[model samples]
Target: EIDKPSQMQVTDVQDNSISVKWLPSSSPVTGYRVTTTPKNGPGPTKTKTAGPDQTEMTIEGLQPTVEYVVSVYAQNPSGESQPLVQTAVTNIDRPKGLAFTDVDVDSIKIAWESPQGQVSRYRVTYSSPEDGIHELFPAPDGEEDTAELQGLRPGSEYTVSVVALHDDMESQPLIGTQSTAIPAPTDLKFTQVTPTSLSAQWTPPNVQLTGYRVRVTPKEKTGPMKEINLAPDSSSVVVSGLMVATKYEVSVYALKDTLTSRPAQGVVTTLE
Candidate 1:
């Protein structure tokens, strides 16, 4: 007569596989059969077999983060033994290669490799302690693997976390931290010019201002550009040390803390 295997146990659980162990039965057996059923109902059942001398089996292709009812039975000459049953759940699957692909003063682009499971969507969270900022962004289900987060502050360091959502469960979060770019300066113009000096001015943006940066480059693109920062309260500056009768290009940038705005530009030839 066939009898149930003794001391059945489940271990080595993973997102896509699991290992089961049992004590061999006393009766002579040709092989043992293991069956796995999803607890959520109406899914494919997985079954595998092991030789008479083998008391362990590893099952593959199991769904991630899902519970299952598992059972093992001994098959002898007399027939199959009573089943030994246990409940097990596989670990959650995690998405891969979470990282930032693009960033702007007010937006950031994040992307990752999808996990090997039926993920319904992606959840992205970003926060900045320096500015008391927090936000949640979600990506829809499908082949799309990236999400853009907007309404962020310029030049701010943000901590980002991303996770895969499947069957009402979330995988462990993937971390990707980065900072947004500074806004570009605007409304730059040359107000005055002389043979050896020139004056430039610009209007500050609505955002806070730290100062200004004036960049001087030869219009012919033959020399290294010169850069200088002006005081926060100053909106205009006269630049000196130039060659008479030479064309030059100057740009102005607004500064806020450590971030700088886009260049507002002007081209002028110094008076001979």
Candidate 2:
């Protein structure tokens, strides 16, 4: 009987192929056959004996991010020996159209388009060259591709990557770069108030600010809301030309170029 091949091992894995190598049998061998098929299935299978003298074979045209079973056999004048069996997984497809959306101070929402095939999951990694932060997260089951990175720093540029996965198999990386916006001003309050004018004071968040926009709306009517723009380092604003025994709403918004944060709001009633 012909002896079975020995030392069979799966070698280089690819996005759509699997390569294998084995040691030749001890006796004179002929008509060696190699069969490959998806694991736990019957279709999409292939068997080949194309080469006259080959100790290695690479199966092609298979789907990416899939596991498969392979068996190899050789025969002499006698019957064939037991076939050598092995299992391997193909590499995964890379992500596409990776983008940064809904960016906020200390956070960024990452979204991507999927490849045209089945996927097991996804892995995301992001870091700042300025040493802002580093993190790793995953989206499971391939049903989703939106990942929100929380607890990040403000205003630092970040380089991020997304990778598709199938169990332990990982794909090539899809890379992108973006930066977080500044946070809104905090602790908005009316510090000094009179019958005609009031003072607005607040603490700025720890971020580079271009300026601040303060909107004061008179409570008595829906008339023109007094919107004032202030310098970057100004901690307070005094609005004059008001009415006695009146209430007003003050909102402070932090700004940086074209980006704006949620406003900090407060209410105060003028003295009688």
Candidate 3:
């Protein structure tokens, strides 16, 4: 029987790399082998070689935001020693730091000052109650650092984050939270074409407008009878549910400082 190598341990693990260390064997060993996997499972997925006396090794080109299980063993005249196992988790890709401007209930724009120093481009991913997944891509080399995402559902909860991609390598992800306008949209417009529905358009006052709102009401009522917020770029909202051959006023504008645009008017006459 051969004595197993002692003090087998991993020293450090980075986004795309990891370093491992272990004690030398008692007898003259031939070499060693290493194996790694993202998730813990059956066999050694990846394998590498090491000298008998070598105490350290580094594995590179690993993916970010992944968990890995690593194992190592010492080779000898008889065979290989029982392997030592360890685990590690890498960070997600993301930018260094980020900030926001022109923030409003309906929209909030964002601009990145710098990258993770190791990365070039930044990826912005947002999740809203209405939309499942939204993504933004910033150029690797460009003067523009700002972007606006719209068509968000009002009065809903959402999460936003940034990711740093370094020379094709991904860093960790950073996240933030923001809310949409309550009650109604910032910019709302209505154009009467038919007796049942109206065409609408609107723009948020805030440049970082993440989304907008649209609500419809009777020509004589103060409360909204119907609503929707599903327009992106070049503000416009459409509404329905009006009395036939009746007249009502429509309004649209971006949301900021809890304000709405001065009402715009469109007379809707239901089918005769």
Candidate 4:
């Protein structure tokens, strides 16, 4: 009679495959037969045999997120022995089609399509150009397929990814990139107005600054607008060479390298 394979174990279970290991039987054996079946409903059974010298073999072509019952039997010239039985579940597949649904200066909404396998939850990870490590967002189990990430920096780029979670295992990551919108300057006002010139002021932004820009246009919109750039340290500027007793629209914007903030606007009429 053949002896049963002993000390059977399962290891390295993945979304589509698993590794099965066992101790060889003492009796002379030509091979070992491995049989696998999904413990749940509606899946086909799989069987394969490994040579006598092999103690481990990988079983492939299984469904993700499905539990499986596995058995190992030793085969020899005498007969086939009783099986060593165990159970394992394949890992969950990763989410796909990761994309940005909405993007703003301080937040972003990400969405994706569900994977073919069932998921208990989802994990979102993101990294910015300024950060040394990625940030993790753990979403509870849900039917929702979208995640919103907050506290992002303005005018910055980030790398983002999504993973499906099932049975305490994380699937492979689906990755993409996104950017945040730039914010605008604030508190634009006219500090002084003379017969020929008008002085304007604005507040700088919280982020690092490259310079400031000011645009002054006549209210009637008949002549060319006057455009000027100020040093990063200058919060105020005198827009000279204006028509006296005429109304003008003035705007200021904060700048960072090539990026520009939205205009902080005001109006003023030059003194007669």
Candidate 5:
């Protein structure tokens, strides 16, 4: 039985795929069958057969973190020869926990924690939600436990997953997701007050938003307001040259997408 499968060999393990090779018998053998079963599951009798002249075949759809027992049998006109058995384990999955930090207007730093268990390496997969294309980030030797991903779109979201590998065994995959932070306003404070002109000192949200739009009007009256764009670094903006000693109301709003944050208000009066 065992002697019949001489020259049988297995190689080329890429992810979950494997290649096997063997020499065909010179004399007439009806066919050969290959049987496989997972190491932890039920006793499997699943099998596949090929013509006696065929020297090699490939089996697929195998899973990770699983051990498979493969056996080859030589079939003949008389009956089937005894089977030769071999064992193998597929790769393992890795853990994941990706987060964003040190966020500024134009850039951010990516971070994550290493997975636990006996993983030989870590496979981090990421894709920009807006782009739809995915890429793999393999940690360097002794670095499979964790790695940082950087240089991403400021306003876009990203999806990520990590897998651990052990040459032939792997653990389950872990996934985490995060998005860029909205810019924050700077140097916010009230300046002068007047009925027609309201003065305020405010910095833009850069390093984090653009400048915010300033909304101003008289508190006593109701009317459509005007929007003023402050410089990213501008700390001072005079509403306008207007009336004296009149109370004016003003509010600042940070804008992003269709949503706007609550306004910061300031009051000012113009003198005679």
Candidate 6:
């Protein structure tokens, strides 16, 4: 009679498969048979036959995130011997590590590393507080891999994120707050300068806006600053209630939500 396979162990565990290794029987053996019986409700039993010199075999076609009882039997001319039994939990397929890399305006790039598993896709997401949401699908494999989204809105804070995907499974999403720069308004100027008031104007930025801001203040001699806000559609404003013959500094700013660009400025002496 052949002896039982010795030192049986469950090694690598994956979504749909379990791998195992063992020491050969004490006496000479023809072969070994490995079998898997699902630990819970109704999943079909599976098996693999190992060659005479083979010490390892993997069982495929099993359900993910579940447990199974594995049995290895040594076979000889007198037939199969006592089995070396072990338990294995076919691993759940949630993979790890997605990080933001080189975030950019009108484009975003991301990277992640993966274990040796069946990872079929990457689910990338970019959500704006103003706009609803955007999603992308890219293939993934290997170590330190990179992916990107080239079509994006300039100067908007996005909830940039990524998720690893396998067939019928998903890993928890990884996320970071990413932002783009806002281009400031250009060509600031003062026109029709009266002693007390002047019109502040500027060319708007090329992107969409929430509004525009115009400020007028005395250049010297302790004085009040006048702040006038305009609608998103407007490009000019008249700031009244100023001092006559005063050197007033005018500034314009472009606004999108809470983000504001640097001040665009001009200086003018009020008409006497």
State every prediction's TM-score relative to the real structure.
Answer: 0.68, 0.61, 0.39, 0.79, 0.60, 0.50
After superposition, the stretches of candidate 5 with alpha carbons farther than 4 Å from their true spots are 1-3, 12-18, 40-45, 92-161, 164-178, 203-211, 217-221, 241-272
Question: In angstroms, how far off is 240's CA in candidate 4?
Answer: 3.6
Model 3's TM-score against the true structure: 0.39
Evaluated at residue 129, the lDDT of candidate 5 is: 63
Report the error of model 6 at residue 82, Å.
Answer: 5.2
| Global lDDT of each candidate | 0.80, 0.80, 0.61, 0.83, 0.61, 0.75
Which regions of candidate 1 deviate over 4 angstroms? 1-13, 19-67, 74-80, 87-89, 131-139, 189-192, 203-213, 220-225, 229-236, 253-261
Q: What is the lDDT for 78 in model 3?
A: 69
Which one is best on lDDT? 4
Report the Cα lDDT for candidate 2.
0.80
- How do the residues 126-148 of candidate 1 rate in per-residue lDDT, one tens digit apiece? 88865675556445564668878
Give per-residue lDDT, candidate 6, residue 158: 75
Can you rank all candidates by lDDT, best first?
4, 2, 1, 6, 3, 5
Worst 10 residues of 1 by lDDT: 133-142
Q: Candidate 4, after superposition: displacement of residue 138 in Å?
A: 8.8
1-272 in candidate 2: lDDT tens per residue? 66778998888888888889888888677767888888965558887873436889988888776678889888655667688999987777777898899888778998898875577777787888656445565354588878888888776678888877776767888999988877778888778999988998899887677898888888866555688899889889998887777888888988777777788889998899
Score candidate 4 by lDDT. 0.83
Query: Per-residue error at 166 for model 6, in Å?
Result: 9.2
**Candidate 1 colliding pairs:** 183-261, 184-261, 184-262, 185-261, 185-262
Q: What is the lDDT of residue 108 in candidate 2?
A: 90
Of models 2 and 5, which has the larger TM-score? 2
CA shift of 132, model 5, Å: 22
Tell me the lDDT of model 2 at 240: 85
Model 4, 1-272: lDDT tens per residue? 67788888886788889898999899888999898899877788999999999999899998898889999988887679988889998888877788797687788898898887888877778888765345555574647678888888787777888878876778999999887767777777778899889987767676767888889898975776799988888878898888878889888878878677778888888887
Identify the superior model by TM-score, candidate 2 or candidate 3.
2
Candidate 3 lDDT tens digits, 182-239: 4333434444457776676544443344444455556654444765654335466556
